[PDB]
Design an enzyme around this catalytic site. Structure first.
Site, mmCIF file in Angstrom:
data_model
loop_
_atom_site.group_PDB
_atom_site.id
_atom_site.type_symbol
_atom_site.label_atom_id
_atom_site.label_comp_id
_atom_site.label_asym_id
_atom_site.label_seq_id
_atom_site.Cartn_x
_atom_site.Cartn_y
_atom_site.Cartn_z
ATOM 1 N N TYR B 136 -2.859 9.300 8.420
ATOM 2 C CA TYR B 136 -2.296 8.417 7.407
ATOM 3 C C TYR B 136 -2.954 7.042 7.476
ATOM 4 O O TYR B 136 -3.333 6.474 6.450
ATOM 5 C CB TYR B 136 -0.786 8.272 7.607
ATOM 6 C CG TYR B 136 -0.152 7.263 6.679
ATOM 7 C CD1 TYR B 136 -0.146 7.462 5.299
ATOM 8 C CD2 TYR B 136 0.419 6.091 7.178
ATOM 9 C CE1 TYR B 136 0.408 6.520 4.437
ATOM 10 C CE2 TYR B 136 0.976 5.141 6.325
ATOM 11 C CZ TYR B 136 0.967 5.362 4.957
ATOM 12 O OH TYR B 136 1.506 4.424 4.108
ATOM 13 N N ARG B 183 5.157 -4.224 13.541
ATOM 14 C CA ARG B 183 5.744 -5.520 13.225
ATOM 15 C C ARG B 183 6.704 -5.483 12.036
ATOM 16 O O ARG B 183 7.715 -6.184 12.033
ATOM 17 C CB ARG B 183 4.624 -6.536 12.962
ATOM 18 C CG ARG B 183 5.072 -7.989 12.868
ATOM 19 C CD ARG B 183 5.714 -8.302 11.527
ATOM 20 N NE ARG B 183 4.787 -8.091 10.418
ATOM 21 C CZ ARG B 183 3.701 -8.825 10.200
ATOM 22 N NH1 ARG B 183 3.398 -9.825 11.018
ATOM 23 N NH2 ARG B 183 2.916 -8.555 9.167
ATOM 24 N N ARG B 195 11.648 2.743 4.069
ATOM 25 C CA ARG B 195 10.280 3.187 4.304
ATOM 26 C C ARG B 195 10.036 3.342 5.799
ATOM 27 O O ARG B 195 10.206 2.397 6.568
ATOM 28 C CB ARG B 195 9.275 2.186 3.724
ATOM 29 C CG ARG B 195 9.068 2.297 2.222
ATOM 30 C CD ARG B 195 7.901 1.429 1.765
ATOM 31 N NE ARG B 195 7.521 1.702 0.382
ATOM 32 C CZ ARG B 195 8.309 1.491 -0.669
ATOM 33 N NH1 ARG B 195 9.527 0.996 -0.504
ATOM 34 N NH2 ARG B 195 7.882 1.782 -1.891
ATOM 35 N N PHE B 255 -15.353 -12.807 9.180
ATOM 36 C CA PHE B 255 -14.510 -12.044 8.267
ATOM 37 C C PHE B 255 -13.894 -10.802 8.912
ATOM 38 O O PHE B 255 -12.774 -10.417 8.585
ATOM 39 C CB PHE B 255 -15.340 -11.641 7.042
ATOM 40 C CG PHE B 255 -14.671 -10.640 6.153
ATOM 41 C CD1 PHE B 255 -15.006 -9.294 6.226
ATOM 42 C CD2 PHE B 255 -13.700 -11.042 5.248
ATOM 43 C CE1 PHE B 255 -14.382 -8.359 5.403
ATOM 44 C CE2 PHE B 255 -13.070 -10.116 4.421
ATOM 45 C CZ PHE B 255 -13.412 -8.772 4.499
#
Ligand SMILES: CCCCCCCCCCCCCCC[n+]1ccn(CC(P(=O)([O-])O)P(=O)(O)O)c1
Ligand SMILES: CCCCCCCCCCCCCCC[n+]1ccn(CC(P(=O)([O-])O)P(=O)(O)O)c1
Ligand SMILES: CCCCCCCCCCCCCCC[n+]1ccn(CC(P(=O)([O-])O)P(=O)(O)O)c1
Ligand SMILES: CCCCCCCCCCCCCCC[n+]1ccn(CC(P(=O)([O-])O)P(=O)(O)O)c1
Lengths: 341, 341, 341, 341
Positions: B136, B183, B195, B255
């Site tokens: 997933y 978290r 969820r 980044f």
């Protein structure tokens, strides 16, 4: 010992950008340039100050270069921020100056006076024609290109032949100055009093008053004038490439190439960018970081300059005003580059 | 050019996090990633909307990446707030998508599809096993890792070698994804319907009902299951270091690094923290500010990761059940970091 | 663990100002600062409680930092409210203080003792001269600045350098304490016994008795003495700017800048304002909210300090008996700010 | 000084409501808004005075703004209570008005003239159609939105972009005004001559003589029209939210949000309430107190507006005529709200 240390401290404070690049040079060559810069900065501080009479500058400026031998001289009520400290304690600058090589001294003093007069010439008048624009840049930046080149030769790191024709050296400075003048448009016109550098011979072709651009209403015309400005800047690129290709010393090269590549990168972001009229367009910290690393040898800098000039021309359209003109300049710039590959 | 200004506006108003980090990239690379995000985000919107029939998804999602070639396609009544505007005005995204090089387009369109079907595989089944949990994460985050990696290569900023084995590129995605999943436990399970992402193969070893953790009654079993999740996350750290250690470009590094350090920082706060079950554990803006500032070069970011991995380990003692399991993963992680210092 | 969970709860109760700014700090950093504050606040309870025999303090204050190693010690017969509960349950404070790094514990134990003896000095004498004034502030405010700076170095977040010249770290505390006094004139003098901090050396040039300002008849001479005090504080602004610019770590900066900006804002409101002698002048919660938001980096906090210093120098005319003295201290700071812009 | 003090006193005496909220602004802005309000209030006093002939109002009102530059102007026999004092001692207002930024003066003077003429228009004709109802509100409220918005931009607190499309600003006013009109029905019709604002276009579907609603007999049809009014008002809510979410400055936000939340709270209480036809419906002092406290940041206020709209849509059954339409406007309102949540 103490004096010279003040120069770098005050330098590091005054110009956070140059202070970094200058570290590319070797101690000796570095100390001279550091002083050379400060002297020019101290001189600039006296002009940019709008709280002192106009006939006062026309009096002391042309005579400024004489203080370089007067270790007791200094000024107190002029300048803003760290700049003030530089003049009030100008003593340290002249102290370090005296210990430099006689050759270096003559160059610094020489350019100082030459640049000083140029400022006086443009104090009692504005930049109306292109010739005015190019000349002004020569006085504030171009001359730095000469002063530096002469300093490279005097050090011995570069062949004397490098000082034969200073046309390209001039182009170098003119490229950095014109790129900044364009990039810092909004920043300058918002100050009190509003600062203008763009030649009337150019912006008049798109508006009656320059402040009109600060309006999203006159955006279209605003961008056109912008591209016109950039076009004028690209005329120096081919010469910038030539100058860089004639440098033989690593230290000297890097120190001269970085600022250039930097400019070309900035020039590619401001080009046909309406944001130039409401904010300060800047490159990512990672971008400059890349430039500072790869601009140590010609070939490398050439591919970066190439890429940035390509990204610039890649930001327009066939049915766009400045098209035809720009492409000619791009091909010219690239030709000069590939000419060294 | 106007179109592009929509992507960033919508980007900023949809992802406070990504919006800032993405600015570390150069416009060329930045425009690609910006689009890539929106496309994926638009996809997420459709898949999440529970009012949309399951079969419509299974049927249209696998062909969502096709509307990128349709510069007139869009959706009307889907999503809430800004995500809806993204779809309704999806025009710009596809418009700007076209103005991108084939290389980038194929990457985005390629990953979009793979991710799309990945979501479908989970629209008709829940995450029971650890493998599911990882599969997933791969579909929703891992692939995002592959995409970026490919884009890096496609830009020429990184060596084409970087794309030979996208294994570590996946670990990069899972670390961020898993951390957030841990978290954001309470918030996710509070939504209607609740969820859940925590794999049954893990929490089932601590409770019958996962909602049971919402009650302070099962706080003990709650934290234990929490530490089980954190452990499963510390399995990617070593690989995260390997990937960041292979990046040579500043922009591409900053980044990619920043988000990772941010993850280790959050993971070091949620670990063995009961509050994770009744609130959202965050890091002070100063901490996260320090992360953006220093995460520009390999060394600096490596000592930060180490700092946070230790602070995390110090939040446990001998008596704690996980202790051993964690100290092992902690060392495995630190050894990797040292290996590059 | 439960002790530390007591400090914050009593911190929120004791001080509603510090309790907020302290959250900008990281965990490790934050814990020490909290203990450091409480240990001192508890010391302020005894030093202020007037219903206490004057000698009961002179004999126990010097030996207060000592109890910092007795996890059972405490005091009950003192306090008015929260301050009363703190000392009585002081146990928790020393309890958690035990788990602080060796380096931290000393910085705390040191300043505490150094501040105890300082307060004992003024319990036998009053504030007469400016010297006595600056000396008192140092003991209760400046010393806090020293301790804080020592904590930053001890944490490693800041350069070990910062601990060399604790003069500015003192100016920090002074500026705050002085602003509080200037603004809290009425609130203090309206108590039994009435509290006065304004040094005789300054207010005696405008009136024979300070309580005279409580009258509408001595308003003109009340404002002058006011603007005189405001001038006395402006002497620290330049220094405060230095200490803030010397910071590098995001967290430490904010926590140190926010309070300074607050004080300055307050000072620009109480300045040349008669309301100061019959009420507590405050800044709109929206103004203080704007401050907390933008005081994260130097440049931002600077343009704000500037703005508020211009707002202050704007509330005075040429016919004012201090225009010149203030208009001199205004640029003193304004330039100190432009010196870092 | 002496004049400004008058304004704030005359203000707190004429409007207990507005006087409290205005304190959310920063002095500079606060004074401008204080003066602005008064000028419009003095303008209202002249119009509402029924003891004065029509030709008088149609003559003086149009030139009222001119008196702003006549520090010696004033009005005598007009109005009762403190309002009359505002005209007679109008000198104070013009004194402070002159000491305001020339940028603010033009806005106040500008809006004043526009609102004035508007009032003159509706002095010679009744409120017949919705177009009128909306226009009237525009004159005595919408323009207040433009002015207030214009002032925000001219203060620098808000972006100049906020003053490009004052359509939402107008919506801000209409919602408030329309809410009051609805609530003050009974009061407006119980005066001599009876003041009516509900446009015929709406109350014609329920009765021939509006006064019929004062009669319990028509309660059934009175309430039905009442909801027709509430429905007309909600049409603005979505726009109100947009404007609020457009604000960036804390002080400017609270000052603009509080009044809006207050209205929505009152509208939800007057909606489908029969008491409106025999008394003034108000919220508990605690409720309004709660609103001031939380209406500081978009999120808090937004979820507060939500709570009230739901409280409203929950005061109706399933067989109520307005039902269907109401929910549409409600959901369409909550939509825009979640569009930011
Ligand atoms: C051989 C290559 C020739 C390139 C010479 C560089 C010319 C650059 C023009 C500098 C003109 C000197 C007068 C000083 C005026 N001045 C004040 C501030 N600055 C901008 C400085 P910045 O804000 O970019 O840190 P910098 O461009 O000197 O680093 C310049
Ligand atoms: C080699 C680098 C690999 C890193 C790849 C990052 C993977 C992060 C997974 C994000 C999944 C994108 C699908 C959009 C679903 N979504 C909705 C909200 N969010 C949370 C967003 P946030 O609230 O934190 O601003 P963000 O995590 O996209 O920044 C994500
Ligand atoms: C590195 C910057 C140095 C800044 C140091 C800040 C010093 C502030 C002086 C506080 C004195 C500590 C002893 C407690 C005495 N005390 C009692 C009440 N207060 C006022 C508190 P307040 O009523 O404003 O919530 P606060 O200013 O401590 O937050 C202070
Ligand atoms: C973008 C913000 C737009 C919000 C504009 C607020 C519009 C408020 C309409 C007030 C019309 C001003 C003319 C004064 C006429 N007047 C007489 C009495 N009142 C009611 C006053 P109240 O009895 O409620 O204290 P207030 O509503 O002015 O506070 C008003």
């Amino acid at each position: 010992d103490e004096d010279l240390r003040f120069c770098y401290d005050i330098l590091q404070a005054v110009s956070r950008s140059f202070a970094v690049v200058i570290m590319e040079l070797d101690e000796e060559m570095r100390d001279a340039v550091c002083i050379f810069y400060l002297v020019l900065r101290a001189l600039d501080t006296v002009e940019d100050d709008m709280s002192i009479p106009v006939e006062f500058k026309l009096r002391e400026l042309p005579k400024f270069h004489e203080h370089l031998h007067d270790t007791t001289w200094c000024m107190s009520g002029v300048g803003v921020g760290r700049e003030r400290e530089l003049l009030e304690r100008y003593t340290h600058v002249t102290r370090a100056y005296s210990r430099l090589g006689k050759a270096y001294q003559d160059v610094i003093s020489g350019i100082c006076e030459r640049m000083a007069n140029g400022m006086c010439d443009f104090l009692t008048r504005k930049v109306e024609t292109k010739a005015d624009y190019d000349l002004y840049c020569h006085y504030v930046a171009g001359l730095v290109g000469h002063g530096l080149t002469l300093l490279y030769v005097s050090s011995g790191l570069e062949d004397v032949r490098l000082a034969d024709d200073l046309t390209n050296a001039n182009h170098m400075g003119l490229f950095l100055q014109k790129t900044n003048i364009i990039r810092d448009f909004y920043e300058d016109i918002c100050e009190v009093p509003p600062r203008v550098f763009w030649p009337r011979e150019i912006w008049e072709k798109y508006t009656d008053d320059l402040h009109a651009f600060k309006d999203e209403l006159h955006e279209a015309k605003a961008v056109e004038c912008l591209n016109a400005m950039v076009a004028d800047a690209l005329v120096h690129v081919p010469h910038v490439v030539e100058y860089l290709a004639s440098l033989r010393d690593p230290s000297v090269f890097a120190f001269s190439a970085i600022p250039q590549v930097m400019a070309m990168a900035t020039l590619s972001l401001v080009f046909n960018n309406k944001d130039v009229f409401h904010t300060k367009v800047k490159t990512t910290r990672g971008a400059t970081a890349r430039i500072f690393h790869y601009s140590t040898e010609l070939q490398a800098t050439l591919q970066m300059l190439k890429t940035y000039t390509l990204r610039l021309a890649a930001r327009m359209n066939a049915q766009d005003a400045c098209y035809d003109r720009i492409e000619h300049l791009v091909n010219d710039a690239i030709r000069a580059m590939e000419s060294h590959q």
